[PDB]
């Protein structure tokens, strides 16, 4: 009886923008926005993620959540791609983009209900972004000298461990900073060659003990045992290592070369053939000074017998992924053939031994103060296997956070723990009333959108938002008789588990946010908020 | 049945917002019409703010409190009824997200509204300008605001004369640090009470100093005016009295009639002889007067006026000085007719009058209204009440405030400037008060048709730099100064509008629960 | 969620016994007491009490609210 109008395409459900479809798009984000509000901060909450394969996952990181969630709606999908923008270029700050871009759209509803055009809303945030990036350059307080000292690395790593693993912040800091200083060289005035790859730090774990018994190795650790009767090398300096792709056996042909057996007379010659050929090839390897042979393939029985008489440690690594990072320490190259250990393909190792880790014996690969290693290993110990795996995810994110300390302006820092967002409120509203025109509406609301960061940390910490927040606003508002402003840039959001009249200072715990992390987060959050405001309508087709 | 928790806070916001939303377009001379379909089949197209909501029945109790607020507000100021309802309703609307979404406790907001009320009243006094209440030419241009767009615009000069001459008699101008300052108290209700006389012309309307009585003289031929009147006021009627016994009078025999009639004529004569002892020229009795008492006072050379109300005799006592006496034998020598100019029997439009008027002002006048018909008299009546209401606001304080959204926007700017040093949780509900102040100039623009976002942004920026006296024009709708086109309302309109709005805002936020049943 | 249908003991009315009435006594006195819990103390707030005619009144006095409070259950 009731006809239909407005949908000329096919049988569908037509949604006109006159019903506030742009508001419904933000409402769909509000469902996901509330998910990230319990994530950011050391007081944040962990989410249980049940994988499609029937695996239980409990983690604070929201990037794992968005990866497991399959998104359709564009405004949420852009935020997922914006999260990947923050995840690929940096290993920290993923919760900053999702929460900020969500609040920028929340305060935009007041402008949409006012009747302010979406294009004029976008123009307001673009002008306020240039005002913010101008301030973010002046919000810089300290900068690291790139001395790469352990204490200097603790200042960077300490705030990174927070918001992920709490209570281990001081314990994990000494473990991570030691592994970074091993693979991080000390140099200046060279920007051509990049340094500190993510693969430079390997993390292994074993059941038993605790984080106090964890140790850091200056090189890679192998799980496999020393199959050969030689358990460890000597104390001589610069032991030569050889990596062979071809298995250890009688010399064969690079193409095929499969040994066939016909009569027992050939088997007697095959045995003596493997005896003379292996003894001839392995002897020339020992004569060249190579005391360790890394075999990427299987090792024959007669190959073990002759190498044990020459005192060469037999070490097998069937995994090619471990051999790739292994070439970054000694510098050896794998040989497809066998019997020609070219010295240019030979590496150098100081110490190869077998250590007992968690009750199991493992053969390590390491060095002492020579032939600098580009790969290190963190040995973790813990009682709970589930919590020990989550610590590994927190350390891996801490390694990618140190990557932001490289050449692209990663030394400068801004006050963290909600200290920067509060000052940006007064600075942007100062530009709002100063800039004439209709932009003052969107510019002032752009500073109000920064109130979510201090409120989020307060809601997750159980603190009263009616107390800490207004005391934090008055904390950055002072009257100074002079040009230089003083008294306090250091008032942050309080992390207390044991109360504290008022709020504390950033200078006490040295908890700050990086400039490269903050400046990149603003650009991604605005472009993500601009993309949602740019969509006034959607078009779909039948699959 | 019962509504508790935050649900009652939602219903209180929905009720006050729905009542205001109707009359939001009823503000301004360009206000749009409203169509109200009656349940009996009729409709009302009038845009009058009070006439609409009066015919609209509401359910939620907060909606009834908004209706009773306008009834009390109409007793103070005669106009601006839609201004108070919008302001009182928008403050609760602006505090709605803070009360719920921000989870601010209502007592925190109510405590902040008390500080916002004091700051708002101080800003109004700063932006206000002084005015001379003694200048007759200035008072006429003020009352003219309540005059124009009405039928009385042609007689407006006479409409002001009726309003000014009335407030000047009632006003008491005094001040000192000794006995205190009355603050120029004027009562329009009781003392200024109008009398509508049919016939004549509007130009013939006079302000009479005295009391007026429509009851005529008991005798057709009487003295039309008394040079030196002697007034006698008394309660007990003049008639043959009755004994304290069961005595009854039943006369059958024909010769027994003159026995009782002689006693009746004697007792009434003694009651009139007690009055004539002071030789009065006027006799006024609260109760009725017998025909025998009329004849004895007829030959005594005095006028008799029967059946005068007790409330009238109290006002007769002020224009005269006659002491109120109960019993006819108790008449005091303090009873005098002094300070009474004349007693006039003059008839206007086949209606006998009584004029006790004198040459002095006994704090209360009498307005004599004339016209071409009763519909004109009712038109002059209600228009004179609005003329005296604006005149009352000017006489109760010598200050004017710019209209057209100038004062409403100027306060919102000053509240935002003060809010910067107001840090602490009370700042959040405080800033919602300034946002509610911008709603009044917003409805004037929405009724005008111009862009509300562009004009309000330029209007608020105009106050931040230029003078606070730059408002919005009603006819045009473009930002203009109130110096060129004045639109000067008295401050009393702005005073009571802000005071009752915060009290109404604190009233609705103070009720967190709703329970029904006896 | 209710208590009824005894399905035995033929009588001219309903009968509720056991933990059923013990829960009804708590739920009845709770809603009645929740009325004056917000009006307690000098910082307490008042409320509007509507009658059957449609009129109402507002007072913060607990003695007046409880006197004008209509309690259906006998436990309250």
PDB file of C-alpha atoms in Angstrom, chain B residues 1-2 61-62 64-65 105-107 110 507-518, chain C residues 34-35 38 43 45-52 54-56 58 67-72:
ATOM      1  CA  UNK B   1       3.347   6.509  39.324  1.00  0.00           C
ATOM      2  CA  UNK B   2       6.873   7.355  40.486  1.00  0.00           C
ATOM      3  CA  UNK B  61       4.425  19.349  36.796  1.00  0.00           C
ATOM      4  CA  UNK B  62       7.541  21.239  35.685  1.00  0.00           C
ATOM      5  CA  UNK B  64       2.932  23.836  35.029  1.00  0.00           C
ATOM      6  CA  UNK B  65       5.641  25.628  37.023  1.00  0.00           C
ATOM      7  CA  UNK B 105      25.914  16.930  40.722  1.00  0.00           C
ATOM      8  CA  UNK B 106      22.884  19.275  40.723  1.00  0.00           C
ATOM      9  CA  UNK B 107      23.856  21.049  43.959  1.00  0.00           C
ATOM     10  CA  UNK B 110      22.741  25.213  41.682  1.00  0.00           C
ATOM     11  CA  UNK B 507      13.847  25.250  41.154  1.00  0.00           C
ATOM     12  CA  UNK B 508      13.873  22.520  38.505  1.00  0.00           C
ATOM     13  CA  UNK B 509      17.371  21.285  39.366  1.00  0.00           C
ATOM     14  CA  UNK B 510      16.412  21.080  43.051  1.00  0.00           C
ATOM     15  CA  UNK B 511      13.745  18.441  42.308  1.00  0.00           C
ATOM     16  CA  UNK B 512      15.384  15.085  41.540  1.00  0.00           C
ATOM     17  CA  UNK B 513      12.288  12.936  42.215  1.00  0.00           C
ATOM     18  CA  UNK B 514       8.658  12.883  41.057  1.00  0.00           C
ATOM     19  CA  UNK B 515       5.979  11.040  43.045  1.00  0.00           C
ATOM     20  CA  UNK B 516       2.254  10.937  42.248  1.00  0.00           C
ATOM     21  CA  UNK B 517      -0.715  10.238  44.505  1.00  0.00           C
ATOM     22  CA  UNK B 518      -2.155  11.627  47.733  1.00  0.00           C
TER      23      UNK B 518
ATOM     24  CA  UNK C  34      14.214   5.535  48.594  1.00  0.00           C
ATOM     25  CA  UNK C  35      11.862   8.538  48.522  1.00  0.00           C
ATOM     26  CA  UNK C  38      17.766  12.182  48.896  1.00  0.00           C
ATOM     27  CA  UNK C  43      22.073  19.425  51.847  1.00  0.00           C
ATOM     28  CA  UNK C  45      16.852  18.306  47.933  1.00  0.00           C
ATOM     29  CA  UNK C  46      13.082  18.598  47.664  1.00  0.00           C
ATOM     30  CA  UNK C  47      10.649  16.975  45.242  1.00  0.00           C
ATOM     31  CA  UNK C  48       7.241  17.463  43.642  1.00  0.00           C
ATOM     32  CA  UNK C  49       4.263  15.473  44.964  1.00  0.00           C
ATOM     33  CA  UNK C  50       1.432  15.209  42.432  1.00  0.00           C
ATOM     34  CA  UNK C  51      -2.141  14.447  43.493  1.00  0.00           C
ATOM     35  CA  UNK C  52      -4.901  12.710  41.496  1.00  0.00           C
ATOM     36  CA  UNK C  54      -3.254  16.944  38.618  1.00  0.00           C
ATOM     37  CA  UNK C  55      -2.120  19.634  41.053  1.00  0.00           C
ATOM     38  CA  UNK C  56       1.141  19.304  42.981  1.00  0.00           C
ATOM     39  CA  UNK C  58       7.116  20.910  46.424  1.00  0.00           C
ATOM     40  CA  UNK C  67       2.410  12.026  54.829  1.00  0.00           C
ATOM     41  CA  UNK C  68       1.621  12.685  51.155  1.00  0.00           C
ATOM     42  CA  UNK C  69       3.350   9.480  49.978  1.00  0.00           C
ATOM     43  CA  UNK C  70       0.938   6.830  48.700  1.00  0.00           C
ATOM     44  CA  UNK C  71       2.105   3.356  49.763  1.00  0.00           C
ATOM     45  CA  UNK C  72       0.208   0.490  48.137  1.00  0.00           C
TER      46      UNK C  72
END
